[PDB]
Structure 1
């Protein structure tokens, strides 16, 4: 009788506070929210998930010796251009990239997945500029 398809939804803005949470276990939930799979009307081919703001992204937490042994790498395309940055240095320099990298590695590849990444707004420290959107705080 033809599956329901929603008309363009009005997206919800939620707020998550990352302080003390485990890096991967939180990414996994931000991925779900960005994909909008918590919504009973979920549709695989439209951006209809939530917008997710995150504060205290520099106070994310991690187990074991990952602060020293977790190595992000970037390849520049040039001979010898494989750069190695440990998690310690990344938190010290570009802390918001840590949760961003982890969320992005759990989103789908392709056009839609890159757009849902743009619906994530990651911030170091407790403040965020999206007061305009009035984000509903979420206990995850």
Structure 2
């Protein structure tokens, strides 16, 4: 039987407050912007944050190609991967990711600041990265947000 009578309430699928926000990447640093984006996606800015529920915001990033990498990171940061075959290690750069597309670079950075579980694998799908300032997300009425305020 329950002798507590004063509990903390967890949010659930029917009680979360999910919103669409738009942030800009005009001159921000890649890691410093992506940490704030990870906090937005996880829902650390909501007073009803619940670590076992998708309670964050759907984030649209515009002007993704204007992001800034300081130092020699654009070609001096060596990402390594493996194909699974002998002699199968490969190298690539943030420049290679940017050439492929800005969404791939942003997804790679944000996955790594997100939790490593099923919930984080679900959360990463709430992020939308676009190269220019033109995107098509009507019927949801996204709200502009100043990322420098956060």
Specify the TM-score bucket, using the shorter chain as the normaliser.
Answer: over 0.9
Secondary structure of the structure 2 residue equivalent to 1:131: coil
Which residue of the partner structure matches residue 5 of structure 1?
A: 10
| Greater shift in the superposed pair: 39-48 or 65-74 | 65-74
CA RMSD after TM alignment: 1.4
Distance 1:6 1:95, change over 3 A: closer
- Unaligned 5+ segments in structure 2 are 1-5
CA contact (8 A) 1:58 1:96 kept: no
Shift of 1:100: 1.3
Which residue of the partner structure matches residue 105 of structure 2?
A: 98
Which residue of the partner structure matches residue 47 of structure 2?
A: 40
Secondary structure of the structure 1 residue equivalent to 2:91: strand
Max radius of gyration: which structure?
2
Which residue of the partner structure matches residue 88 of structure 1?
A: 95
| Greater shift in the superposed pair: 9-18 or 103-112 | 9-18
CA contact (8 A) 2:102 2:129 kept: no
Q: How many residues align?
A: 140
What is the TM-score with the length of structure 2 in the denominator?
0.86
The separation in 1 between residues aligned to 2:53 and 2:144, in whole angstroms, is: 24
Shift of 1:87: 1.6
| Greater shift in the superposed pair: 18-27 or 8-17 | 8-17
What is the TM-score with the length of structure 1 in the denominator?
0.92
Which residue of the partner structure matches residue 60 of structure 2?
A: 53
